[PDB]
Structure 1
Amino acid sequence: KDTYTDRLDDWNGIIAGNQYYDSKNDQMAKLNQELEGKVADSLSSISSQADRIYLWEKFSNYKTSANLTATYRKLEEMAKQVTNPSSRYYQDETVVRTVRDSMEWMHKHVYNSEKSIVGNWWDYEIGTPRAINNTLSLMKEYFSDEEIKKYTDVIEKFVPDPEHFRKTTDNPFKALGGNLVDMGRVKVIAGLLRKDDQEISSTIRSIEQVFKLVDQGEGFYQDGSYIDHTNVAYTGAFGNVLIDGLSQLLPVIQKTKNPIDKDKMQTMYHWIDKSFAPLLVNGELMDMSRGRSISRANSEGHVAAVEVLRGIHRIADMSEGETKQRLQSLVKTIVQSDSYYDVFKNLKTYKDISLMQSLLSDAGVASVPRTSYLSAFNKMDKTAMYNAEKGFGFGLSLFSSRTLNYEHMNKENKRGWYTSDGMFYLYNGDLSHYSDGYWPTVNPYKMPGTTETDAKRADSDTGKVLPSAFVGTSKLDDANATATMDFTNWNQTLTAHKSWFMLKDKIAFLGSNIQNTSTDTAATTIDQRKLESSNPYKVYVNDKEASLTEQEKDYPETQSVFLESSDSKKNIGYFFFKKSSISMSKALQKGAWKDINEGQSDKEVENEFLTISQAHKQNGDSYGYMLIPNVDRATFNQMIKELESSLIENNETLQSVYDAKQGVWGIVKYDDSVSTISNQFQVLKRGVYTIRKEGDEYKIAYYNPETQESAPDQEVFKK
């Protein structure tokens, strides 16, 4: 037809990619097989009675917005197969008619301009409109330009403003980040379908705002943080949608009369390198950045990671030169480092499958293991650490007066209460740790690293910001950093000065000033590790094999605990600076995804967990231990002997551990008193420090969590 159909043709190549299909292509044929079965199920179950209440019974309750999107997504699947020469439904008269028909019926009795949002606005302005655009785009050769307009009319009624969503409501909000991108997949495509030029130009102009880094509110920050939903760390869910959708759109947008300036898009590489890259470990997308998505059974870390990777790859393909090359190497090495998840299980279009296949087999693209790195995402209170030498990742999940602890929205993530209360993540040889039903089987009252009372929590509860702004990380280099959280629990009955000292190949956990004014007992979960029936651990307490049971066994006078696997890369050792009183247990924990997410399956799931905790029976209590992963038993025993004097201090005003091997100090000062460290120097300001002694010199890394600022050396360091 015209230039719009041209772009609409490019879109089809991106969202389905029938033109690249190849039956002799294993991965492609697998996805085709999947779509064939989908429309087969849809067709064999659609209602074909004279006068019907619903198109599909499973999605009849049209009061539930979700049923509109699910119903239309089914027609998009039919539209994909009907235009695929290799599909059994290719140009099928029945399939063509049911799509056209279904569009009309849905339009007649369910979704039209004369209707109003009922349920989630999201489906009315994003979910459904996208499915409609895609369906009309794929089958434009079967619809009249007039019918197309007719069917996208309702989209214009609900989403008239490319800059605001929920415009038909009493409180529309400005589209930013992920939402802004979907606004493009809604109005740019719909604009294309309607041959509406003003719509295209204004939506693109509106989309261009996503390329702006922010220093407040929602968006990407200079330090790599990405905030969404007012104050929630969301690089891993909304960031996904952002990069995923934008990467699909850009190729199309760029071929219009309103291409986005190159210098304007250059910021995308900032997101990739500073925001996304650090959150990817062995093909897994750190859960601490995925908000409520963690409660979705079909979006575990490795799966969520491919959403980002496919977006990054599309961007690399859109680039050229070293940029294309480096991005390709980035995607290639990450995917190849994933021995647990098959990346193709989440490449849902032929072009995406194709791109990935050529990348993996192109010998010209280097795939070299990622180097060590430490990202201090202070603008979202998270820290990601990775050691390339020992091969383990570490995630520190916190929150402050600037951020919400956990998101429970739309009945999702009902029990994430403590996932940001100083929760830590360890990524080692067991790539499936946080997968295979970890979230619905993990005991939510004992999130690893967290200090909490055992009071009962309500599923109906929702997030809160922390009273204190004294939460933050001061990074010295790629292997060393220190963090602290002026912790107070959800009902202000317990406090604790929790601090972490990341020192290259280990992390020390220090807690002091632990107080409890309530009646419930207080304890810190040193860990709750999910086990693999295939790789059993040999537990040692004080280097003596211990036999754990579902019943908590107490181990007083503990100097160390060691979990031994046949794979050094799965070993976890804990050295207690001062002999401590801990309790351990290994028990089968059962649950269902529905428990933490109403819309998930109620199917029972179960996993075996090893729980280690330390009770706090008095005020002024404390804890102190070093987490040492990926070393064998003899090396762990020898190391804890060397660290016998690493703890420099752990009280209510000062906390610090020292790495003699590196000549690095980790320090946290809660007050402005003069602290003399190791009889060598003085730290003078309240805040977080990471210092390295280089012979006669001292490299200083100071951070003031409250003002979110560093400071001149002479202000905080002396001698």
Structure 2
Amino acid sequence: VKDTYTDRLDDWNGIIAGNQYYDSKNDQMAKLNQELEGKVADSLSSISSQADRIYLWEKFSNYKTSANLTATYRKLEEMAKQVTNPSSRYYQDETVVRTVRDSMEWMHKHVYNSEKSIVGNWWDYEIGTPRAINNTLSLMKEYFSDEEIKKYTDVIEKFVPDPEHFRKTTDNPFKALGGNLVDMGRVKVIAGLLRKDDQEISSTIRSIEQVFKLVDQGEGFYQDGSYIDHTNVAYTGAFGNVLIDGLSQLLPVIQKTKNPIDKDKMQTMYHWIDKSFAPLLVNGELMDMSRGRSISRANSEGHVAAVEVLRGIHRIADMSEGETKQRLQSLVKTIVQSDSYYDVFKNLKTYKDISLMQSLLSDAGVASVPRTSYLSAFNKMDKTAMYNAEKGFGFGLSLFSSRTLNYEHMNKENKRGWYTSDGMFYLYNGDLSHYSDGYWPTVNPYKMPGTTETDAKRADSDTGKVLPSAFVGTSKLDDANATATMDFTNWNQTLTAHKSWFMLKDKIAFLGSNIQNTSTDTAATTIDQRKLESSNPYKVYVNDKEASLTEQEKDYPETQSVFLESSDSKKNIGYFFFKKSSISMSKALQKGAWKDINEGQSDKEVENEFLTISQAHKQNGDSYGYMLIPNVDRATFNQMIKELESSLIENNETLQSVYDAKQGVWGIVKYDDSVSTISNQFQVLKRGVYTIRKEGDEYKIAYYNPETQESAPDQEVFKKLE
């Protein structure tokens, strides 16, 4: 029956499909249409049309595997999209209409109904499938009777009767928050509209409002921009994605119901965009350190995942007004235009999203200016993101502590992310494809960049752990300078190391001390493991002399520097060792398959060439110290290292500090409360992390106590000399 409920469903259809906006003369839209035409064609030709069939699609036949239910229903949603698209060859097709109706009834009688119980993954029974069913019925509401709609959505009410919890029919339900809570809306708000149930709509929207509250503990968005999910996992880039992507779709509909959400409540979304998401986007790529186990999905590499966030932001801009709308448009526009590697349209899956992006990109009134430098210390999730606009590089520091899990391996995904938070670092430079094109299945998991580990064999069946210490954190001085430390102990408590980082505008110093090993395994720090481009080969220099790397590891004793020279200076990487160090390097082709790190992925062999740099630690009390200097040419790098000749202030078991004389900035990490005199100019007095700048006779102080997660009055931690 056509009423206010169907009106809302019409709006929903315009959002999840947007057939009303389709234009055959629009190349990008025609491309998506062609993709849907092909998917429906394949589904129609491979579907079982035999009496007493045991499945609809042979490749999604084992229904004890919950994933097969969602995949099946999604094929029907695709049919619904095309049967209602005037330009599709399947528009109002009698066979497709009957195929959707008959398939819904078949699955309802033999696979998914109220008399069934969760078998496999609860997510498919409560989120994946219900969403696919809601969308199918919404799109084809003019072909189904209200009784049929209520009949096919009864199963949804059986598995998801409570808008505040998931796994309600199990022996361990949980409180819905974040991304999951948003999906709760895409399940019950739409189901409510389809069933014309006001109580379901109102109660669900009320539950959804919890999402706008910032938290100071547990799962959710924090004031400092961090986002935690799954109890204690940094997750802005995966579950946070689902949250903004799904919520931006729902809001236009929710705001037109009899239960619209207060404007002041939704105000926090802008905080998420500017504080949480924006910093994690560099040249169109969403930083992997925020994506949890999703890094192990071949169809979701960094640039693809970023689009989930960007399309969400764009929709929010569209529903905003004035300056707010204008600036959000500019944010999306500059990020998209800075991405010369990935075509944003490859992940805009509805006509309205495509249309919005096209108008934005062609609107001269919307400014597209390169983003400025920034540095975000996401202490509540132990990650740090840095971006230098002058030189054009981004830097990500991935840590964990007693407050956070190191890596997530679940649902057979991310089987080898063991060391992705053991002080792993990311460098975002001119090669926008670096962490893409098969990086994850080919990178050697035992040598993640920046990590100090023993060479012990690790099991794919292992799961994450928290760190014994709470002494992990970042002290930020300004948009270009910060200092971080991690009181590191490895997975089996056989190795320790005081690892610290000194972000000094256009370079990052890496210092490690107190390196100890009680095992029979060899210990070493991976200085880098960089994925190469066959098109842009690097010329390697050691102590400014060209070196020829081989698949076989070569030792370079008394190394003062290593320089990776590209034809594009924006891809150059230099490493300056404060004190001559003994390192080893190799360049080799590494093969692997996505299935190796994610059971549900393809076993197809992938291969990439990597340049690995390592420093062995054969004695207790060992240390390492070097400066990473990106994006400068060879002559400039050589000049800079001479300027940094005496930049290392100290690197021992209680004090680590680097000084940038050009800036007049000091980075300092203290592991005890002894009085530390620095550069015969001032003293720092407390265990913690510091970033200090001298501006003649004045001193700006940034102190952070990572264990208590508090700063402190200047006189408690700093004292100028004389």
- Could you tell me the TM-score, scaled by structure 1's length? 1.00
Distance across 1 between alignment mates of 2:289 and 2:378: 12
Q: CA deviation at 1:570?
A: 0.1
Structure-1 residue corresponding to 2:495 = 494
Distance across 2 between alignment mates of 1:131 and 1:143: 16
Distance across 1 between alignment mates of 2:663 and 2:415: 43
Distance across 2 between alignment mates of 1:59 and 1:540: 53
Q: CA deviation at 1:563?
A: 0.0
Q: CA deviation at 1:77?
A: 0.2
Q: Deviations over 1:77-101 (max 9, x none)?
A: 0000000000000000000000000
Q: CA deviation at 1:552?
A: 0.3
1:199 matched to 2:205: no
Q: CA deviation at 1:670?
A: 0.2
RMSD of aligned alpha carbons? 0.2
Q: CA deviation at 1:331?
A: 0.2
SS of the counterpart of 1:645?
A: coil
Q: Deviations over 1:49-106 (max 9, x none)?
A: 0110000000000000000000000000000000000000000000000000000000
Q: Deviations over 1:321-343 (max 9, x none)?
A: 00000000000000000000000
Distance across 2 between alignment mates of 1:281 and 1:16: 29
Distance across 1 between alignment mates of 2:36 and 2:98: 18
Q: CA deviation at 1:525?
A: 0.1
Q: CA deviation at 1:363?
A: 0.1
SS of the counterpart of 2:62?
A: coil
Distance across 2 between alignment mates of 1:471 and 1:613: 24
Q: CA deviation at 1:599?
A: 0.1
Structure-2 residue corresponding to 1:223 = 224
SS of the counterpart of 2:644?
A: helix
Q: Deviations over 1:358-384 (max 9, x none)?
A: 000000000000000000000000000
Q: Deviations over 1:120-147 (max 9, x none)?
A: 0000000000000000000000000000
Q: CA deviation at 1:6?
A: 0.1
Q: Deviations over 1:642-673 (max 9, x none)?
A: 00000000000000000000000000000000
Distance across 2 between alignment mates of 1:603 and 1:699: 54
SS of the counterpart of 2:10?
A: helix
Q: CA deviation at 1:445?
A: 0.1
Distance across 2 between alignment mates of 1:284 and 1:645: 36
Q: CA deviation at 1:513?
A: 0.2
SS of the counterpart of 2:142?
A: helix
Q: Deviations over 1:364-415 (max 9, x none)?
A: 0000000000000000000000000000000000000000000000000000
SS of the counterpart of 1:142?
A: coil
Distance across 1 between alignment mates of 2:358 and 2:43: 30
Distance across 1 between alignment mates of 2:108 and 2:364: 51
Q: Deviations over 1:531-551 (max 9, x none)?
A: 000000000000000000000
Q: Deviations over 1:134-178 (max 9, x none)?
A: 000000000000000000000000000000000001111000000
Distance across 2 between alignment mates of 1:621 and 1:249: 55
Structure-1 residue corresponding to 2:250 = 249
SS of the counterpart of 2:377?
A: strand
Q: CA deviation at 1:44?
A: 0.2
SS of the counterpart of 1:314?
A: helix
SS of the counterpart of 1:644?
A: coil
Structure-2 residue corresponding to 1:159 = 160
Q: Deviations over 1:277-312 (max 9, x none)?
A: 000000000000000000000000000000000000
Distance across 2 between alignment mates of 1:320 and 1:74: 37
SS of the counterpart of 1:341?
A: coil
SS of the counterpart of 1:298?
A: helix
SS of the counterpart of 1:151?
A: helix
Distance across 2 between alignment mates of 1:108 and 1:353: 38
Distance across 2 between alignment mates of 1:170 and 1:584: 53
Distance across 1 between alignment mates of 2:76 and 2:673: 65
Distance across 2 between alignment mates of 1:210 and 1:266: 11
Structure-2 residue corresponding to 1:473 = 474
SS of the counterpart of 2:299?
A: coil
SS of the counterpart of 1:548?
A: coil
1:114 matched to 2:115: yes
Distance across 1 between alignment mates of 2:5 and 2:75: 25
Q: Deviations over 1:599-630 (max 9, x none)?
A: 00000000000000000000000000000000
1:619 matched to 2:620: yes
How many residue pairs get aligned? The number is: 719
Distance across 2 between alignment mates of 1:438 and 1:121: 31
SS of the counterpart of 1:594?
A: helix
Distance across 2 between alignment mates of 1:674 and 1:155: 64
SS of the counterpart of 2:645?
A: helix
SS of the counterpart of 1:623?
A: strand
Distance across 2 between alignment mates of 1:563 and 1:274: 34
Q: Deviations over 1:481-505 (max 9, x none)?
A: 0000000000000000000000000
SS of the counterpart of 1:119?
A: coil
Give structure 2 stretches of 5+ with no counterpart: none
Aligned identity (percent) is 100
Distance across 2 between alignment mates of 1:524 and 1:51: 61
SS of the counterpart of 1:150?
A: helix
SS of the counterpart of 1:566?
A: coil
Q: CA deviation at 1:200?
A: 0.1
Distance across 1 between alignment mates of 2:557 and 2:501: 24
Give structure 1 stretches of 5+ with no counterpart: none
Structure-1 residue corresponding to 2:79 = 78
1:582 matched to 2:583: yes
Structure-1 residue corresponding to 2:644 = 643
Q: Deviations over 1:559-603 (max 9, x none)?
A: 000000000000000000000000000000000000000000000
Q: CA deviation at 1:276?
A: 0.1
SS of the counterpart of 1:688?
A: strand
- Could you tell me the TM-score, scaled by structure 2's length? 1.00
SS of the counterpart of 2:526?
A: strand
Distance across 1 between alignment mates of 2:171 and 2:716: 51
SS of the counterpart of 2:52?
A: coil
SS of the counterpart of 1:445?
A: coil
**Structural mapping, 1:565-714, within 5 Å:** 565-714=566-715
Distance across 1 between alignment mates of 2:51 and 2:578: 77
Q: CA deviation at 1:554?
A: 0.2
Q: CA deviation at 1:187?
A: 0.1
Distance across 2 between alignment mates of 1:228 and 1:655: 33
Q: Deviations over 1:400-446 (max 9, x none)?
A: 00000000000000000000000000000000000000000000000
Distance across 2 between alignment mates of 1:659 and 1:454: 35
Distance across 2 between alignment mates of 1:257 and 1:325: 29
Distance across 2 between alignment mates of 1:100 and 1:424: 52
Distance across 2 between alignment mates of 1:88 and 1:571: 51
SS of the counterpart of 1:50?
A: coil
SS of the counterpart of 1:426?
A: strand
Distance across 2 between alignment mates of 1:501 and 1:105: 62
